[PDB]
Design a protein around this nucleic acid. Structure first.
Ligand SMILES: [K+]
Ligand SMILES: [K+]
Ligand SMILES: [Mg+2]
Ligand SMILES: [Mg+2]
Ligand SMILES: [Mg+2]
Ligand SMILES: [Mg+2]
Lengths: 88, 25, 223, 105
RNA sequence: GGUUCGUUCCAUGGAAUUAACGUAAACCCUUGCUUUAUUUGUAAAUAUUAUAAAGCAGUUCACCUUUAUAUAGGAAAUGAU
């Protein structure tokens, strides 16, 4: 097995999405509710608990976003030293 | 005078006790 | 055991400061009849004096800024629900869990209204993405909705069924009583809004897989 | 606990119980309706405009007697002055913001 | 590369340093407060509505968080105001 190549000269060395764009934590809860209605029915009693969990989602506040990741700043410092150059 | 005689009316407790005393069928 | 001033507060447990008999010292404590305990109950804020559901449902009755009329209508609705016989819950239409028994709703017209709205309110909404399902068809995907959006959709369904019903009598209670009757039909499970709730829930279950459709994840990633 | 508004009683003046409760909300929130007599004199505005104006008036006057109630009148909403005002009519608009019908063709 | 309502601010570039206009600032009405004035307005008055000249005021302080340590941001009826 070979080793990682040395990147050619790029206009800019950076990652598109520095911070992980996490998903809405409740879109998974809704899928569970929609899963019960398919197996247990709509007006059934088994799905009475998952519905309460779904109603608990929107009543809770949205977590605040995290501070930006400084990865792109450090990638731009070591570009010329880590790759074959920088394109003009 | 009413607190001692227990005559001070409180609509909140009146409705609560009536509903919990099984008097509403 | 005859009560008198010198022993009234001592035997009745009432605060003389609250009644002003022996007020405090304003020059020292700053008050004269005691300080209200903080935080205050939400109902003491003049902008949140009414229940969240009652205040929200009232302004849905309003038209042309006539809030005083809508406030009197909501007062007639709560008065009608308070004079109607206890409802007969239908096992086929289970109300929201944790609700009080049907016998308690008449004397608590606010909960009568709340239980009704929170019971027929849907849990999801159908959003469509333009031109991602095929030959110009849209990609419908369900999504949850907060409480205010759930109650708003519910009560607007009720008013839609009310406006289409025919006139019954005369006076100032026509619209009020016509709405209150629909609130009772909802709790008894014999209303028409239950069909609209189940109809939108079917679309959610019939499209629960579109949450990860190839079109929703390949917008501009197929250059 | 006697309240007068322009000489008339609180009920003879406001024909809407919502406005009566809002005019003396400061005394109600602090539970002092039966401790003070108010003699209000309002001018200009409408029914709700005057009602909310008396709310702030009594709150300020009440704090002159018991300055230690401001933390409570804060959470009651009787200390803040609501600056909302009718927006003027603007030329080219039907109202403050309503625009006339725009014809594309 | 970050940040900001914003070519705003910070850092940086084997090329930059500055000017004008727009922007911004300021101005007009409005909000709280201070002083002045009291008739043709104000029930009385030991002056508080109204009238109108000037001045002051905010994202200011507190709390929380905070990158490259350089420039900051958030919370919103239950800190102050
Ligand atoms: K207008
Ligand atoms: K003035
Ligand atoms: Mg009439
Ligand atoms: Mg430069
Ligand atoms: Mg400008
Ligand atoms: Mg004169």
């Amino acid at each position: 097995p070979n080793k990682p190549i040395r990147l050619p000269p790029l206009k800019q060395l950076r990652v598109r999405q520095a911070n992980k764009a996490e998903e809405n934590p409740c879109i998974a809860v809704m899928s569970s509710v929609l899963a019960c209605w398919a197996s247990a029915g709509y007006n059934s009693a088994g799905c009475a608990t998952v519905e309460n969990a779904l109603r608990a989602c929107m009543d809770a506040p949205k977590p605040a976003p995290k501070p930006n990741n400084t990865i792109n700043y450090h990638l731009s410092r070591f570009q010329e030293r880590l790759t074959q150059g920088k394109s003009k | 005078e009413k607190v001692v005689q227990g005559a001070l009316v409180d609509g909140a407790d009146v409705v609560k006790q009536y509903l919990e005393s099984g008097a509403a069928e | 055991v005859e009560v008198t001033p010198e022993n009234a507060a001592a035997l009745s447990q009432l605060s003389e400061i609250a009644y002003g008999v022996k007020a405090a010292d304003v020059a020292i404590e700053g008050h004269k009849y005691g300080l209200p305990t903080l935080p205050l109950p939400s109902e003491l804020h003049h902008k949140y004096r009414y229940s969240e559901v009652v205040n929200h449902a009232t302004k849905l009755l309003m038209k042309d800024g006539k809030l005083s009329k809508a406030q009197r209508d909501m007062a007639m609705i709560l008065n009608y629900l308070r004079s109607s016989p206890p409802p007969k819950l239908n096992p086929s239409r289970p109300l929201i869990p944790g609700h009080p028994p049907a016998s308690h709703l008449p004397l608590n017209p606010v909960e009568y209204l709340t239980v009704a709205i929170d019971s027929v309110a849907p849990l999801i909404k159908m959003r469509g993405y333009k031109g991602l399902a095929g030959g110009g068809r849209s990609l419908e995907v369900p999504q949850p909705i907060p409480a205010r959006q759930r109650r708003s959709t519910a009560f607007k369904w009720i008013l839609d069924v009310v406006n289409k019903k025919p006139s019954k009598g005369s006076g100032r209670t026509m619209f009020a009583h016509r709405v209150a009757e629909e609130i009772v039909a909802v709790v008894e499970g014999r209303s028409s809004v239950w069909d609209k709730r189940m109809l939108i829930h079917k679309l959610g279950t019939a499209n629960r897989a579109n949450l990860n459709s190839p079109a929703l994840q390949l917008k501009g990633k197929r250059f | 606990g006697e309240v007068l508004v322009n000489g008339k009683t609180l009920a003879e003046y406001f024909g809407r119980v919502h406005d009566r409760e809002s005019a003396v909300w400061a005394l109600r929130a602090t539970n002092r309706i039966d401790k003070y007599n108010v003699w209000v004199k309002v001018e200009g505005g409408g029914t709700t405009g005057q009602a909310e104006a008396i709310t702030l008036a009594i709150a300020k006057a009440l704090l002159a007697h018991e300055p230690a109630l401001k933390p409570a009148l804060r959470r009651a909403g009787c200390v803040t002055r609501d600056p909302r005002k009718v927006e003027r009519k603007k030329h080219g608009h039907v109202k403050a913001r309503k625009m006339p019908t725009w014809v594309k063709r």
